[PDB]
């Protein structure tokens, strides 16, 4: 309801939202991509669901940093729809107390690590403490309870705590906490490609035919 341009206390509101709400917003996007039509908000705690879709729809037509945005925001719709496909097998929880593929048609290394890395998970019967194809699972689905590129945030939440069994060699290294931290950003930015990859592949294989 409020208007799309006005001014009030000396500053610009977009449909009711002053620069703090408006960049806030944008922290919130690219941490958590969009929310699918309806999702659970600090600077925004007193904007009502009225307000929101306002801006998100005008937020929408402006974007079609421009491209930035549009990629962050696509790629988190990509891992949101790979973790929901598998969720229900795998559960909640990492190491309790599985299904998972990405079909890149062997376009990144993806396939040819994963083969290498469950060989030594299955031959040794270590499959918490050898990262494998398990563990980039539970790294997507980290990125999204957690938002974008927050190592800290999913290593220290019980729920993924997998992530953190192949690294108890090198606990006592003082850049321990960043060994990690450039592991999982090395390979998650593997898996955004294959992500990335598989749909392309995906609406290739449609021909341009809806």
């Given at each position: 309801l409020p208007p799309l341009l006005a001014r009030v206390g000396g500053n610009i509101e977009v449909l009711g939202f002053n620069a703090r709400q408006r960049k806030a917003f944008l922290n919130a996007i690219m941490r958590y991509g969009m929310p699918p039509q309806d999702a659970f908000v600090r600077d925004?705690?007193?904007?009502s669901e009225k307000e929101f879709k306002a801006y998100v729809s005008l937020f929408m037509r402006h974007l079609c940093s421009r491209q930035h945005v549009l990629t962050r925001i696509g790629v988190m719709s990509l891992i949101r729809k790979k973790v929901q496909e598998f969720e229900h097998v795998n559960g909640?929880?990492?190491?309790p107390e599985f299904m998972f593929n990405i079909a890149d048609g062997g376009f990144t290394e993806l396939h040819s690590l994963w083969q290498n890395e469950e060989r030594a998970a299955t031959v040794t019967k270590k499959t918490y403490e050898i990262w494998h194809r398990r563990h980039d699972y539970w790294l997507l689905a980290g990125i999204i309870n957690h938002?974008?590129?927050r190592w800290q945030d999913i290593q220290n939440d019980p729920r993924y705590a997998i992530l953190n069994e192949?690294?108890?060699?090198?606990?006592?290294?003082?850049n321990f906490l960043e060994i990690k931290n450039k592991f999982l950003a090395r390979r998650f930015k593997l898996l955004e490609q294959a992500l990335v990859i598989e749909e392309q592949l995906r609406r290739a294989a449609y021909l341009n035919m809806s």
């Open positions: 925004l705690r007193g904007k909640r929880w990492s190491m938002g974008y590129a192949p690294f108890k060699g090198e606990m006592n290294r003082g």
